[PDB]
Design a protein around this ligand. Structure first.
Ligand SMILES: NC(=O)C1=CN([C@@H]2O[C@H](COP(=O)(O)OP(=O)(O)OC[C@H]3O[C@@H](n4cnc5c(N)ncnc54)[C@H](OP(=O)(O)O)[C@@H]3O)[C@@H](O)[C@H]2O)C=CC1
Ligand SMILES: COc1cc(Cc2cnc(N)nc2N)cc(OC)c1OC
Ligand SMILES: [Cl-]
Length: 164
């Protein structure tokens, strides 16, 4: 099983602020759908909460929420008490995806063999309570696309990385 991580970050490494994603780049949500469609999507409890209620569970995917609380309620999702448990509920899924947030990416990173990153050209100065992207060392190899204009007026680009 190829455990993948998918996220969007500013160039500075911010993925979340004030419980939200601090930009609007539609092309990123489209990409996210394209990558994750048909697979398990594993998320931390706070990410689950960040999603608008009507958008969740994410359709066409098996949703899993990681919590320490074995009685946590996620309507339309399986709740798991660890990342290892989350990966077990993925079953025979050949390519489960971890979809955030900061805490869960760090948990998953040792299992991961693929990362799909959208970089957003926005000037965000890291605050103390920002959610931050994991750093990838050079065991990770891949390709970086060209800068693209979003409908938003910001630029973005895709990075695809893998390791054995
Ligand atoms: N730009 C992007 O690509 C994305 C951005 N985000 C943003 O990221 C932020 C959320 O990230 P973050 O705050 O780090 O939270 P997470 O989504 O990573 O969830 C953290 C929670 O996961 C549970 N948890 C953590 N570690 C463990 C463990 N070892 N075992 C079991 N459960 C565990 C806990 O839930 P509990 O307390 O219930 O036990 C904890 O509160 C939001 O702002 C969101 O909008 C999210 C997804 C993608
Ligand atoms: C489809 O809507 C959402 C998707 C995500 C997760 C996510 C979004 N973009 C990327 N590139 N990777 C991800 N893991 C996170 C969200 O909010 C925190 C979303 O709603 C706004
Ligand atoms: Cl990067």
């Amino acid at each position: 099983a190829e455990v993948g991580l998918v996220w969007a970050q500013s160039t500075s490494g911010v993925i979340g602020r004030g419980g939200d994603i601090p930009w609007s780049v539609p092309e990123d949500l489209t990409r996210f759908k394209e990558v994750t469609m048909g697979h398990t999507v594993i998320m931390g409890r706070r990410t689950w909460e960040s999603l608008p209620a009507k958008v969740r569970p994410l359709p066409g995917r098996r949703n899993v929420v990681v919590s320490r609380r074995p009685d946590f309620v996620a309507e339309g999702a399986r709740v798991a008490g660890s990342l290892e448990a989350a990966l077990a509920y993925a079953g025979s899924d050949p390519a489960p995806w971890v979809i955030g947030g900061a805490q869960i990416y760090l948990l998953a990173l040792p299992h991961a063999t693929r990362c799909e990153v959208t970089e957003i050209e926005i000037d965000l100065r890291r605050d103390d309570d920002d959610a931050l992207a994991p750093a990838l060392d050079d065991s990770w190899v891949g390709e970086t696309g060209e800068w693209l204009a979003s409908r938003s007026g910001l630029r973005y680009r895709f990075h695809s990385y893998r390791r054995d």
